[PDB]
Design a protein around this ligand. Structure first.
Ligand SMILES: *CC(=O)N1CCC(CNc2nc(NC)nc(Nc3cccc4cnccc34)n2)CC1
Ligand SMILES: [Zn+2]
Length: 313
């Protein structure tokens, strides 16, 4: 019996010393086993593996507690999706573009890059520690684990076409938006005024218009009477708001928003690009960067910084 010493983990923080038999596979000794995302379940240990750290599935109480506190789940389906995704996103390149971490294009990841650039420009705290840790390193330039975790938490695989707003809505449900609140009024001339309150993710996202300013002044929506009603923002308490609308030509002005999602395509497929407002307007497309003092293009999401707003209507 020849052996080597290795470490197993589920969180990459608590390391557990193991002795492994070099005549058996990792699968025979640990169950499913991953080396930096690469599935080594069906391979035998090699001399170079001494002292290396391997991911295993939560198969005992120590590992179950560690995975539960780190990912907020012990389901072996999750860690497998995460490792499968990580085996690809560790080979993506993550260039700094206009001071933000982007992703060089690969595996249809334009939507992922647009969402990653967006997460770096809005105040947000994730509840699962795995998400918050990988978030910090994603800001620092090493976003392989963040992107793999996003794909895993949203039940998305590498290469699949994706939607930025669906992605953001998933990630928001894993963030601490408990304090967020929105109060809206809907006015009809022949029916009266109705107030509704929303909390959490619903207080932070709206579908139907891109302009925060128009949201505050009022938007027309069909009413129950068959006439047309006016809906407007009464009160907002959130670190940011996300206005979305079906892709359409929109004029973005410097200094009036935080960032935005460009979308050229149809309802099945399109190209996602990222507009950000710094000292001027910038468009980021993977590793590509252009600027313009004026912008008129197809926008589908606009992000605004917010703290507390109260109407004067
Ligand atoms: C930037 C990015 O990641 N991005 C833009 C290019 C597309 C191309 N890939 C792709 N994959 C699939 N899979 C089914 N389908 C399409 N469809 C498509 C592309 C372009 C035009 C039209 C027009 N009508 C229908 C479909 C398409 N494209 C990947 C995502
Ligand atoms: Zn009415």
């Amino acid at each position: 019996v020849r052996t080597i010493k290795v470490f197993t983990t589920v969180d990459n923080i608590n390391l557990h010393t193991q002795v492994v038999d070099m005549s058996m596979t990792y699968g025979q000794q640990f169950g499913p086993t991953y080396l930096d995302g690469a599935d080594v379940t069906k391979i035998k240990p090699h001399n170079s593996h001494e002292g290396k750290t391997f991911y295993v599935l939560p198969n005992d109480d120590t590992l179950r507690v560690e995975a539960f506190e780190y990912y907020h789940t012990t389901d072996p389906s999750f860690l497998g999706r995460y490792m499968s995704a990580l085996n690809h996103t560790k080979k993506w390149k993550y260039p700094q573009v206009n001071g933000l971490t982007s992703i060089k294009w690969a595996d249809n990841n334009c939507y992922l890059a647009t969402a990653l650039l967006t997460l770096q420009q809005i105040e947000l705290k994730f509840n699962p520690p795995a998400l918050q840790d990988a978030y910090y390193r994603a800001r620092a330039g090493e976003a392989a684990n963040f992107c793999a975790l996003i794909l895993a938490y949203c039940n998305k695989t590498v290469g699949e076409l994706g939607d930025v707003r669906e992605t953001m809505s998933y990630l928001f449900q894993h963030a601490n938006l408990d304090s967020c609140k929105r109060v809206l009024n809907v006015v009809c001339k022949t029916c009266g005024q109705q107030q509704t309150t929303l909390k959490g993710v619903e207080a932070v996202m709206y579908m139907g218009t891109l302009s925060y300013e128009q949201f505050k002044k009022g938007v027309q929506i069909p009413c129950t009477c068959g006439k047309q009603a006016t809906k407007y923002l009464v009160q907002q308490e959130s670190p940011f708001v996300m206005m979305s609308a079906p892709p359409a030509q929109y004029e973005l002005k410097h200094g009036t928003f935080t960032c935005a999602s460009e979308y050229t395509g149809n309802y099945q497929c399109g190209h996602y690009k990222h507009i950000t407002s710094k000292e001027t307007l910038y468009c980021i497309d993977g590793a590509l960067l252009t600027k313009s003092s004026e912008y008129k293009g197809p926008i589908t999401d606009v992000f605004y910084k917010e703290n507390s707003y109260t109407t004067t209507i």
